[PDB]
Ligand binder design. Sequence first.
Ligand SMILES: [Mg+2]
Ligand SMILES: [Mg+2]
Ligand SMILES: [Mg+2]
Ligand SMILES: [Mg+2]
Ligand SMILES: [Mg+2]
Ligand SMILES: [Mg+2]
Ligand SMILES: [Mg+2]
Ligand SMILES: [Mg+2]
Ligand SMILES: [Mg+2]
Ligand SMILES: [Mg+2]
Ligand SMILES: [Mg+2]
Lengths: 174, 174, 174, 174, 174, 174, 174, 174, 174, 174, 174
Amino acid sequence: TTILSVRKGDTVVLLGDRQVTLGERIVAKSSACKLRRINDDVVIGFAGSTADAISLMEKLENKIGEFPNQLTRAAVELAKEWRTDRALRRLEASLIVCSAEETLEIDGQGNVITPEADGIVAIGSGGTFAKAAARALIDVDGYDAEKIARKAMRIATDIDVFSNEHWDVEVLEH
Amino acid sequence: TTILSVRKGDTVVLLGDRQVTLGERIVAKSSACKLRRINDDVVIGFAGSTADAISLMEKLENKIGEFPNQLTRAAVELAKEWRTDRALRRLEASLIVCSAEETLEIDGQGNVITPEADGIVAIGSGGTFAKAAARALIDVDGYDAEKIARKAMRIATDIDVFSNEHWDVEVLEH
Amino acid sequence: TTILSVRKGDTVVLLGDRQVTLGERIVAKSSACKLRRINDDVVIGFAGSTADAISLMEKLENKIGEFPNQLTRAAVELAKEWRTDRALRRLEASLIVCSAEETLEIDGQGNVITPEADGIVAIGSGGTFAKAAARALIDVDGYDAEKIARKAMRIATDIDVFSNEHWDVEVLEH
Amino acid sequence: TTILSVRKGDTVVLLGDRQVTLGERIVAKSSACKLRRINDDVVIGFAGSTADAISLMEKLENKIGEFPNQLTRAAVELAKEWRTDRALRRLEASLIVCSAEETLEIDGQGNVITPEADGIVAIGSGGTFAKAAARALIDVDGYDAEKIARKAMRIATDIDVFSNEHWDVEVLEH
Amino acid sequence: TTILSVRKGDTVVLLGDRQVTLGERIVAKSSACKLRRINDDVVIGFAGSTADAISLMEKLENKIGEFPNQLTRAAVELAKEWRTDRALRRLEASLIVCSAEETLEIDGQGNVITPEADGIVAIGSGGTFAKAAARALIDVDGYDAEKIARKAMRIATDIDVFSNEHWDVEVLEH
Amino acid sequence: TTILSVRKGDTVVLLGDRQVTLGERIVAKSSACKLRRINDDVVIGFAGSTADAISLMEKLENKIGEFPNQLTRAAVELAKEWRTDRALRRLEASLIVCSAEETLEIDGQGNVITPEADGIVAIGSGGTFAKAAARALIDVDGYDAEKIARKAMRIATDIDVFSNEHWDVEVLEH
Amino acid sequence: TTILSVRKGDTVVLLGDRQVTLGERIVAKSSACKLRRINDDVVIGFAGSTADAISLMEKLENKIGEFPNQLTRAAVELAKEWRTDRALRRLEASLIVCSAEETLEIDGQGNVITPEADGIVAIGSGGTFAKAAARALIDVDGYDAEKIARKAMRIATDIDVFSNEHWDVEVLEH
Amino acid sequence: TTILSVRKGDTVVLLGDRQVTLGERIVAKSSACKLRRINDDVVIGFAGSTADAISLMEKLENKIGEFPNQLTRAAVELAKEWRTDRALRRLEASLIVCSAEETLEIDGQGNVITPEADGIVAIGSGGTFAKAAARALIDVDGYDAEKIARKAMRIATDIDVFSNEHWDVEVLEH
Amino acid sequence: TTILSVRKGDTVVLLGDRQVTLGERIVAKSSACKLRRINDDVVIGFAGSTADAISLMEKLENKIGEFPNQLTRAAVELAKEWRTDRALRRLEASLIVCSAEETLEIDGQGNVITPEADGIVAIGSGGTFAKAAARALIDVDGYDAEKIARKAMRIATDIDVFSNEHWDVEVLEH
Amino acid sequence: TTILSVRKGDTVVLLGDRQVTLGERIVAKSSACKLRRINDDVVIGFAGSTADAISLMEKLENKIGEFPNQLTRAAVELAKEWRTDRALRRLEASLIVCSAEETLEIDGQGNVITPEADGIVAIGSGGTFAKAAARALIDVDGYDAEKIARKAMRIATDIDVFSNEHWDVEVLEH
Amino acid sequence: TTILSVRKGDTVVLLGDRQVTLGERIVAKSSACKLRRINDDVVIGFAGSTADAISLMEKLENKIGEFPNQLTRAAVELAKEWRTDRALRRLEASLIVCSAEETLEIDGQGNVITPEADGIVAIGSGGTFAKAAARALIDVDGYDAEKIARKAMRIATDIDVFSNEHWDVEVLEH
Ligand SMILES: [Mg+2]
Ligand SMILES: [Mg+2]
Ligand SMILES: [Mg+2]
Ligand SMILES: [Mg+2]
Ligand SMILES: [Mg+2]
Ligand SMILES: [Mg+2]
Ligand SMILES: [Mg+2]
Ligand SMILES: [Mg+2]
Ligand SMILES: [Mg+2]
Ligand SMILES: [Mg+2]
Ligand SMILES: [Mg+2]
């Protein structure tokens, strides 16, 4: 999996590939969507299985509802619950959550990672490749967010055997 | 085990072999049925032990009854419960669920997989061989769903030491 | 352990050896009974420890009382409970259950196995050897169920270092 | 540890060594008693730690009180409880229980072992040696139960590095 | 693999299945011959890979040539060389060697096994099932060596997921 | 890797993908050739590293030179040397060798596999998928060897994360 | 395996069982001889495979020939060679060597063990049980060496699942 | 850690070192106190982490309060609770408890060890060295309990890389 | 370690970081040079220890001297030797070899990798990050080989905890 | 094993126990001598098997003969050879070598240890306990070397389950 | 072990602790010297056993003799030989070599490490603590090399349980 978010100027984009792999060997599906719109202002991308990721997305929505505008605090409360609840700890997943203002990455180890000033966050077996490529383009004038993200995904997913070339895209502004 | 579903035109078929293997070494039964009719519109096939599979089938029926026409939502709710409930997580099984409209594959990792446009889904040690063979025939005119499935099963079960040459067949239309 | 059941014509027999082994090395007892009569119509044989097997037999009796003549259903319900209850899953055992009509094998993986048309079921470290020998004789006219079983046990228990030459026998008719 | 029981004629004896070993390397105590009198008719010997063994002895007393004369039934009920209760399964011990009439061995795997006609039962790292030696003497002239048990313990505890030469003895008659 | 030899009266037969399995999962070939005629008087059957077995068959021929009529001595000299030579010890195989007079089994652990009075020897993942079934028939009316062997193979190979239903046969007399 | 050979009528084809993967995770090269022409009559395809495969190809040339027309014998001699030579056993690779007449597969376990009557042989992580798909098409109208092979590669390499969509082709006739 | 030697008075006996076991699970032969007469004055018994034991016996004969009357020195020289030679160290076996004067036990760890004053030596999975039983009887007047050894074997082999009830006997005097 | 108690004549001393080690590699503190005075009559020393030891000291105080003068009974009750309670079993620690009359050692395996007639008990990685040295001096002229204990600690802590040279001392009389 | 080579137009650059890490934990040196000029036309960079890498560089120089202009053939011969020679296989390293014309990567698994049309090759724990960043910039205006390489190293070495910010550079033209 | 050397004044003693243990479980001999006189001025004690230790003693004698008075240099040359020779490294043993002047301990890790000013050296599973007890007594006036060594052996061997109470003694003066 | 070298101005010092530890648990010697003067101009310090280190020091002396003034080249040649010679690779050690001009560290992984400008090199379990402390003082005026090293050793050896407080010192000038 490769999930990549790039914020530049007043645009943030979130991209995810569509490959589902079993046994770390075989592609079982090449058209799976790994992004979800949870409301008008918030999108989320996941590495992990459908059930694992959706269970965590539902707990995130509880938190987001309990802390209306404070996305960061919702993420942190989620990560706390995730690490201390016995059932949730048996889940394997990583998330990236975006609003126009904020991007957070949350993983099963309990890290909550916001981007550096370059606006880039990524997860999955391919995420680090994507991040490296996006970082190479972030400051090159005339490359907006979406153009950076597409190029970075092509490069990351060509390298990662666990990600494919078909991508879903979400965009946000303010 | 090989469970294979092929949808082509207005027909979907679901086929399963009949071998039960212990210790990954010995055939303990060669005539076990791995398909179940859960109502007039829905059939299901399983890899895993009788008790493990039936326990998950019963939970699926709860979900199907709680989300009457939405087979996909039932499958997802099942997968969520399966991954988060302590007792169910100690079960090992994979399921394919068919209606005339929809086919879903659900596994213990929490994946819920629908087919590509070719209408093929498969599970078990032999499933991927079956899928490769079915894919080779899917678009060859004059091979209908059942003919594709039978040919694919012969091939997959000849290769997989853990599946045999005796198959059960279910068919659905709309 | 070798537990063997053979049904031929209107007779079914159930035989078990009497060796109890510790550490997979030493005979601690050579005269242990591994068969139980649970009522006039039903006998059961076990591989596993006394306490493990008896705990499961008691649960099987609950299920037999709850599904009076449907011995197959009782066995499946037992297996479901066995796989989903935390305490029972810490037990290790296999069972064969016989009535005049039906024979089932149930194991800790949740398999419930009925015989092929040859009427033969077996469990334990020696069970497969017994089954192979019984299958060789099942169709030879003049060998009734008890004669087949005795011969098969002599052969299986001579090969299996974990089973001995002393056997208990139960018989049923209808 | 070596615990040994020998029944011959109207006498049964129960003997245990006195070595406590830590880390499978060092003698921490050479004078530990491993036998207990639980009433006038019943004695018990243990392999395992003080606390583990005493916790099981107390449960055995519950069962003995619940099945007044039926020492076998009490042992079996104990073994059942031992194998199904989460806390008791974290204990490591083996027991021999004697009355004038009956001797039983109970271990953590859930075996409940009564002796063969020779009247001999034994447990611990040295138990099998003791048993072999006692079996050699059981039928020989001049050797009553206590004389057999002493000789067998000398031989067993000389061979087992985890047992010593100092022994406690209990005797019963009817 | 299942290799089975049965001697009854003045006939000895040697039978082998034809399945080659990779990764303990997939049938790569269903028509491989596992028997070799090494001269007019001597046939040999193998479990293991083509190269491993043929390398050991060649060394066996050296020994057979060096000890003309003494098939047992040749087998022993082979087994000695096999266990002490560094290159040969990296091979994995078992052999059965037949003449009209003698049958020997030789394995990588250095065992050299001649049959009991029943004349039966077998090797491979299915060998013990075959032997059990052949032993059930060895003394029964109407069954010569070949008939016993064919029946025993059907039974053994049905059980062993690593052997198939296609068999080669060699026969010898004197 | 996926290497696939299909013989139908007087044509045999050999196809391979071009992906090189490191650490079972990353594509280091997407344009590597895995087929070699060793003379006018013989082509070979490999799974494994460049150096490992080439070292074995060179030894196979020695054997081909030493057994001019007997490609089967050369392959067997290669496999014997491979299994008994200390340096060669530290190599990991599989090979498929074709002439117009013969196809053989040779692996590190010492198997030498010729095809069934269908003419199909395959190796690599994707080989079995390719074989299943090719077997589905082998007997169907309109499909010559090359058309079968291309279709089977597309299917196999779409499923295997360790093979890509770019293929080299070799063809032979007689 | 159980090999036992008992010296009492002017008689020494050497006994061995006849069971050969594979995979620590199945009896492959019940009539194997584990004793060898190497000359008129010397007998030897072995635990381990035919080839392993015979290879070491042959090296022992070299040493016995190089140190004519000094059986103890030969044994030590053998053990030295066994531990320092690369090929011999890949062998697994234990030996007991008897003359009328001397008994030595030699194992793969390089121990060379002579008996205590009681004249008893034993090896194999059952050896220690045999020793314990022999030691119980060694000083009981009217039990000569052979009577002790037979009784000890019955006991040891009843307990050891890896030894059987059929024994070979050698006797020596001076 | 080295905790050592010596009772000689009417004096008992308890000594402990002061080193705390992390990762079995690094001294994190060289001045940690491992002895506690729990009332005027009772002192206790611990191996294990502050939190683990204190939690078990508190439970010991509960028991000491529930069984006012019976120190041995309190120690046994503690050990029973320790071995059966899920939370307490995840602790690692060993304790020595002293009064003027009694010394007991209690460990996580559930041993409750009282000294031999020499009055010496010890725990920790260094405890057995300390015990050996104290035993050498226990019966020698010119050495009272404290002098023995100091000398034994210097020796033990010089050897044990996990104990240091700084010691706390408690003394009791009656 | 990060070694990165970028060829664009008539310029090829080779860059390496300077960090040496021990135990996968600590920087032992931050100023180590990982590039070597082997003649006027050929530069080489290495991941691995000084001794391992120099021993392989020397063998590469033998090959380069034995195949004067054929860099590719030299690399392949090196990789062959490396994989088949016992001493060289105990070495751990990876190499990138550049001339003005050709770039090759050689690793301990025996892969010999040339770049794609983009001219980029990289090795070490950071190499894949560097490659991803360099691939993002390879086709963009304003960026020559050296500028690409520097930017890619900054990015890769900021991510890789095993690579630092100090780089050596070699340049070649033709 | 416990081997202990104590030098005090003009006397050095070397003591060793006599227990040989197999499988870290059973005493196979209680009267084995572990000391050797190699000439009038030099004695040696060993932990390890007879053959291992004697092989090393013989190499030590080669060195002692090649460096006549320089015991320390002989030991070091032995240890160098032991660590660099392939056959010797497969041996497991530790040695203590004494003359009147010098005591050295040599182990399989290549340590060559001389005593501190207290004159004490020890090896084996019990060695450290012996050392601790000897150190306690070394400076107590009126305890000579032999009295210290005997007391220390009683203590160490009472604690070590792998050493017994029977000791050999060698003494030297100058 | 802690070996530390500090070069400041015209002085270089080399310090080592004196603790020898066995089993990662016990101090076997507290006064072992870990430095050697190999000639007037060159000193060396070692972590590892006596034999391992001395064997490598002797090979270093061969190299130093073969490359008279080029200490660096000698070190590198040593490291090459160390990594490629079968016997030397079975050794475990690390070395620091000093002359007045040069300091090199050489380890079993084949690193050859020269210091940064601060002149500090260190090895052993305590080496990195020593280095850190020496780096804090290196630039503080009035702290010469020997004063820095002593302070750094007190700090590093107080932390490392595997190093002691007793140090050997060598000094060099030019
Ligand atoms: Mg990809
Ligand atoms: Mg099959
Ligand atoms: Mg048996
Ligand atoms: Mg003992
Ligand atoms: Mg089969
Ligand atoms: Mg692919
Ligand atoms: Mg037996
Ligand atoms: Mg210390
Ligand atoms: Mg970095
Ligand atoms: Mg002892
Ligand atoms: Mg220290």
